[PDB]
Design an enzyme around this catalytic site. Sequence first.
Site, PDB file in Angstrom:
ATOM      1  N   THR A 195       0.815  -1.212   0.000  1.00 47.59           N
ATOM      2  CA  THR A 195       0.000   0.000   0.000  1.00 47.59           C
ATOM      3  C   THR A 195       0.851   1.265   0.000  1.00 47.59           C
ATOM      4  OG1 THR A 195      -1.444  -1.353   1.391  1.00 47.59           O
ATOM      5  CG2 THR A 195      -2.113   0.940   0.954  1.00 47.59           C
TER       6      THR A 195
ATOM      7  N   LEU B 209      20.760   3.326 -14.423  1.00 47.36           N
ATOM      8  CA  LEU B 209      21.270   4.336 -15.334  1.00 47.36           C
ATOM      9  C   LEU B 209      22.583   3.873 -15.956  1.00 47.36           C
ATOM     10  CD1 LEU B 209      20.397   7.464 -13.197  1.00 47.36           C
ATOM     11  CD2 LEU B 209      19.007   6.231 -14.867  1.00 47.36           C
TER      12      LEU B 209
ATOM     13  N   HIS C 147      -3.024  -1.617  -5.844  1.00 48.87           N
ATOM     14  CA  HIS C 147      -2.621  -3.002  -6.078  1.00 48.87           C
ATOM     15  C   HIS C 147      -3.877  -3.873  -6.063  1.00 48.87           C
ATOM     16  CE1 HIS C 147      -3.377  -3.734  -1.851  1.00 48.87           C
ATOM     17  NE2 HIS C 147      -2.493  -2.812  -1.518  1.00 48.87           N
TER      18      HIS C 147
ATOM     19  N   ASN D  61       6.272  -1.368   3.114  1.00 50.98           N
ATOM     20  CA  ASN D  61       5.440  -1.067   4.279  1.00 50.98           C
ATOM     21  C   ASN D  61       6.238  -1.152   5.584  1.00 50.98           C
ATOM     22  OD1 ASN D  61       3.107  -0.428   2.859  1.00 50.98           O
ATOM     23  ND2 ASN D  61       2.046  -2.371   3.292  1.00 50.98           N
TER      24      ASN D  61
ATOM     25  N   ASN E  78      26.385  -0.135 -10.338  1.00 53.25           N
ATOM     26  CA  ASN E  78      25.819   0.541  -9.178  1.00 53.25           C
ATOM     27  C   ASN E  78      24.310   0.364  -9.096  1.00 53.25           C
ATOM     28  OD1 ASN E  78      25.181   2.168 -11.358  1.00 53.25           O
ATOM     29  ND2 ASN E  78      25.942   4.078 -10.444  1.00 53.25           N
TER      30      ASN E  78
ATOM     31  N   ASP F 108      -9.246  -3.799   0.102  1.00 49.02           N
ATOM     32  CA  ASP F 108      -8.117  -4.571   0.620  1.00 49.02           C
ATOM     33  C   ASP F 108      -8.499  -5.336   1.876  1.00 49.02           C
ATOM     34  OD1 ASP F 108      -5.356  -5.202  -0.009  1.00 49.02           O
ATOM     35  OD2 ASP F 108      -4.867  -4.159   1.858  1.00 49.02           O
TER      36      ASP F 108
ATOM     37  N   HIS G 268      -1.197  -9.785  -0.963  1.00 54.58           N
ATOM     38  CA  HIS G 268      -0.622  -9.145  -2.135  1.00 54.58           C
ATOM     39  C   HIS G 268       0.760  -8.642  -1.763  1.00 54.58           C
ATOM     40  CE1 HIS G 268      -1.129  -5.318  -0.134  1.00 54.58           C
ATOM     41  NE2 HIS G 268      -2.302  -5.791   0.240  1.00 54.58           N
TER      42      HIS G 268
ATOM     43  N   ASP H 134      25.623  -1.465 -15.458  1.00 55.43           N
ATOM     44  CA  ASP H 134      24.953  -0.911 -14.291  1.00 55.43           C
ATOM     45  C   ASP H 134      25.444  -1.637 -13.040  1.00 55.43           C
ATOM     46  OD1 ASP H 134      23.359   0.826 -12.926  1.00 55.43           O
ATOM     47  OD2 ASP H 134      21.533  -0.422 -13.096  1.00 55.43           O
TER      48      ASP H 134
HETATM   49  C1  LIG Z   1      13.864   8.370 -11.177  1.00 58.11           C
HETATM   50  O1  LIG Z   1      13.844   9.808 -10.974  1.00 58.11           O
HETATM   51  C2  LIG Z   1      14.930  10.331 -10.190  1.00 58.11           C
HETATM   52  C3  LIG Z   1      14.707  11.822 -10.088  1.00 58.11           C
HETATM   53  O2  LIG Z   1      15.424  12.532 -11.089  1.00 58.11           O
HETATM   54  C4  LIG Z   1      16.275   9.977 -10.824  1.00 58.11           C
HETATM   55  O3  LIG Z   1      17.324  10.390  -9.950  1.00 58.11           O
HETATM   56  C5  LIG Z   1      18.035  11.559 -10.409  1.00 58.11           C
HETATM   57  O4  LIG Z   1      18.694  11.353 -11.657  1.00 58.11           O
HETATM   58  C6  LIG Z   1      19.348  12.530 -12.159  1.00 58.11           C
HETATM   59  C7  LIG Z   1      19.866  12.204 -13.548  1.00 58.11           C
HETATM   60  O5  LIG Z   1      20.982  11.321 -13.535  1.00 58.11           O
HETATM   61  C8  LIG Z   1      20.434  12.989 -11.182  1.00 58.11           C
HETATM   62  O6  LIG Z   1      20.997  14.229 -11.607  1.00 58.11           O
HETATM   63  C9  LIG Z   1      19.861  13.165  -9.780  1.00 58.11           C
HETATM   64  O7  LIG Z   1      20.935  13.394  -8.877  1.00 58.11           O
HETATM   65  C10 LIG Z   1      19.052  11.934  -9.343  1.00 58.11           C
HETATM   66  N1  LIG Z   1      18.395  12.167  -8.066  1.00 58.11           N
HETATM   67  C11 LIG Z   1      19.003  12.670  -6.985  1.00 58.11           C
HETATM   68  C12 LIG Z   1      18.148  12.819  -5.762  1.00 58.11           C
HETATM   69  O8  LIG Z   1      20.186  12.992  -6.994  1.00 58.11           O
HETATM   70  C13 LIG Z   1      16.375   8.477 -11.071  1.00 58.11           C
HETATM   71  O9  LIG Z   1      17.562   8.187 -11.800  1.00 58.11           O
HETATM   72  C14 LIG Z   1      15.174   7.963 -11.862  1.00 58.11           C
HETATM   73  N2  LIG Z   1      15.264   6.521 -12.025  1.00 58.11           N
HETATM   74  C15 LIG Z   1      15.365   5.922 -13.216  1.00 58.11           C
HETATM   75  C16 LIG Z   1      15.474   4.425 -13.196  1.00 58.11           C
HETATM   76  O10 LIG Z   1      15.361   6.560 -14.263  1.00 58.11           O
HETATM   77 CA   LIG Z   2      24.471   2.761 -13.341  1.00 58.46          CA
HETATM   78 ZN   LIG Z   3      -2.789  -1.169   0.056  1.00 60.60          ZN
END
Ligand SMILES: *[C@@H]1O[C@H](CO)[C@@H](O[C@@H]2O[C@H](CO)[C@@H](O)[C@H](O)[C@H]2NC(C)=O)[C@H](O)[C@H]1NC(C)=O
Ligand SMILES: [Ca+2]
Ligand SMILES: [Zn+2]
Length: 775
Positions: free
Chosen positions: A154, A661, A304, A175, A657, A256, A411, A655
């Site tokens: 939730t 990204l 959900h 949760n 890390n 739910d 769920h 990836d």
């Molecule tokens: C989901 O959205 C967040 C918000 O932007 C993404 O995190 C940021 O990504 C940018 C681009 O690389 C960075 O400059 C920021 O520093 C990130 N957030 C923070 C708090 O620093 C995140 O990458 C996104 N997730 C996906 C999978 O695309």
């Molecule tokens: Ca990465």
């Molecule tokens: Zn819920």
Amino acid sequence: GSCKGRCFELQEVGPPDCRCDNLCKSYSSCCHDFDELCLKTARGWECTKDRCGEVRNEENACHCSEDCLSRGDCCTNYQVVCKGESHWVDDDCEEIKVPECPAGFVRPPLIIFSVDGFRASYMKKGSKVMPNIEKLRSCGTHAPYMRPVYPTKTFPNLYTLATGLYPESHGIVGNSMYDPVFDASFHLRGREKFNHRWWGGQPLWITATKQGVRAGTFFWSVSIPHERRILTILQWLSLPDNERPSVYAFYSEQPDFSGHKYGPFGPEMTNPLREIDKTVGQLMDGLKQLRLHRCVNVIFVGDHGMEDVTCDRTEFLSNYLTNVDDITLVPGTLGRIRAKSINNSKYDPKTIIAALTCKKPDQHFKPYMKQHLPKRLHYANNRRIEDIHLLVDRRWHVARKPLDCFFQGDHGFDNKVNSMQTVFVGYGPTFKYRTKVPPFENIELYNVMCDLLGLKPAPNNGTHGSLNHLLRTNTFRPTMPDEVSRPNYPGIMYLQSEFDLGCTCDDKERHLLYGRPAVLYRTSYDILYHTDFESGYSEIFLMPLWTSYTISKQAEVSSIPEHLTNCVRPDVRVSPGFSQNCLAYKNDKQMSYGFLFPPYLSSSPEAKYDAFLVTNMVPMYPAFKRVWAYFQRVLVKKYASERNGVNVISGPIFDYNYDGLRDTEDEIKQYVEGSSIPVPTHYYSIITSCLDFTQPADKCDGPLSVSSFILPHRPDNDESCNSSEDESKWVEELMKMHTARVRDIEHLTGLDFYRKTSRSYSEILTLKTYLHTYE
Ligand SMILES: *[C@@H]1O[C@H](CO)[C@@H](O[C@@H]2O[C@H](CO)[C@@H](O)[C@H](O)[C@H]2NC(C)=O)[C@H](O)[C@H]1NC(C)=O
Ligand SMILES: [Ca+2]
Ligand SMILES: [Zn+2]
Ligand SMILES: CC(C)CCC[C@@H](C)[C@H]1CC[C@H]2[C@@H]3[C@H](O)C=C4C[C@@H](O)CC[C@]4(C)[C@H]3CC[C@]12C
Ligand SMILES: CCCCCn1cc(-c2cc(=O)c3c(O)cc(O)cc3o2)c2ccccc21
Ligand SMILES: [Ca+2]
């Protein structure tokens, strides 16, 4: 000290003046007269003919006096009973082309009606138990279902809805949560949840207020009955333009609650579904009274679904581990395993998951290091997410000891599970009339909702414009990203003799259907043309970023000629300095190599030689090669045979890390031995064809069909308990668990696809957000 005329105000009060808020009870700060004054219940919530014209008695829950609508506190059925007006649901649907709002309304108000555990299937099972909900669905804009985020619990989903962020980004990753930085634990029951430190991102009520749009409280104390929530919202909507919020939220614990006890498909679900509809009819009967029923945009949305789950189908860790007392487990429909660090010498992550791996013939859970979880879940990049994850099979639970039925439903499972799907409905002037839309993910609602409020969305994980087909107006116009790096197109620059790569070989328009992928980061890449495929070779990663090719339905498959089985040829178009060395693969005893364009699908015996080019080679583990060989020799031709040809885009993803990204050169942790050649964390492939399967992929004048995957490049196949059987048994099941959206690959690659189609950019965005579920 008193709540007189103060009931359900929106006043922001830090200490000390005692409280009359919608959440004063959860905080224990209610002024004393809140229950009597604010929580009235006398004479029920619906006018009766005898009450019409009544003199005002303050104590009645609602009022049927003639002064009631001047006061904005009529029972929602006042005009139906008293003024002989029709129930909204009994009225025929008329298209709301322009918002018919009172003057002074700056914005078409928006109301979010959230329902806990509303399975998408409940909609059918209840066309007659939910007449109001069904009119909103039929005459507004609706999807067959809406995908929740994982975990399908939730709080992660309600906050994802509020933010458009994956749980790992907003931080409500479950949760229940332990946070090592805080050294603190979050639970659905307790006051820790009220602390702001847990809640990252920017929820919709903050986006709006920060931009000058007032919001009503999205949170209701449970002691406040649903009917009274509908009356408060209807009362806030009668306030003057200064005080009147633009956006509102109603929440229902149902279904739910009942889905848990009786199960998702019990005949006992009906009356819950009917109670909800009456609360909808109250809101629409209320809105119509205020003549706001053709002015307010209403969203009906769940968090959900509900699945058949009983305490009988419970796997117990104690049956797999030796020291269940030296571990903490967040149990249920998902597993999270942490060390009870005190008394915790024996706890070793590697021993733990080995002991949990394929130990029983029908194991109803799989262990997972969070990084190796399917990428489509985006569930790894938070410190509150334990390294050890248990992916539980639908209809099952996991628990520590046999000593941990009261519940026939639950769920939380994987978000591709159909029983976890939920509903979305849109009704109002900004929404489309009598229109239907494809299933979309709940991370995209946040943008739509900003659009419906004229709000600039905070950075989030929706793809703005992917959902423009939901709306008749409030258009957001998407723009293709611009190519950062531009391609060099090399020629025969060097000589076969200038190459000393230790590579040996007994040598002796149709493929780029949807345009060149844009490279949206700064790098140096070369487009490489061949008879059977085109590629963009990274001179940095010494591999192709993308490899694109087209396999027609009638294509033939061919074996690797035994004289080329270990043949790697040097591409004269690319520097010896910007190429891999076969020697590296020899030295690397655990590393082997594969090819992006399969030599199995070569067009000629002569063409096949191109597939053995060093510029089509990538590091591949012998265990993964089993998976890739099967995909390349068997499944591509099979997909082509089923879809009347397929265009395929394959390549590497980095990836380490686990942020979802594209990795930078420094982020890469693993290379081939003594090489500058990077080992990918995953390999992707985007497989496209004409949705109109009567048209070959290369002659397709309409919508596109895609399926995609981000397969994990693992040194073993332990994820596949049936890995020992033929690949006919397990490979495709693995690839189905790692279904991916093109969007998800764009993030992991820095690449932009479908830049040269006949479709609108909005459609293409919708196409990149699609996830082939196989459910
Ligand atoms: C989901 O959205 C967040 C918000 O932007 C993404 O995190 C940021 O990504 C940018 C681009 O690389 C960075 O400059 C920021 O520093 C990130 N957030 C923070 C708090 O620093 C995140 O990458 C996104 N997730 C996906 C999978 O695309
Ligand atoms: Ca990465
Ligand atoms: Zn819920
Ligand atoms: C006990 C239950 C009935 C209610 C539980 C309510 C709790 C989850 C809600 C209540 C108030 C919420 C915060 C409030 O809207 C202010 C913001 C600031 C924003 O930047 C991030 C979110 C945050 C902290 C909300 C988090 C959820 C809260 C605590
Ligand atoms: C645009 C964003 C839409 C989402 C609206 N939204 C409603 C929440 C809610 C309200 C309650 O009143 C409530 C309750 O009374 C009991 C209970 O167990 C849970 C409860 O959660 C909630 C929480 C976290 C993030 C978002 C949320
Ligand atoms: Ca997206």
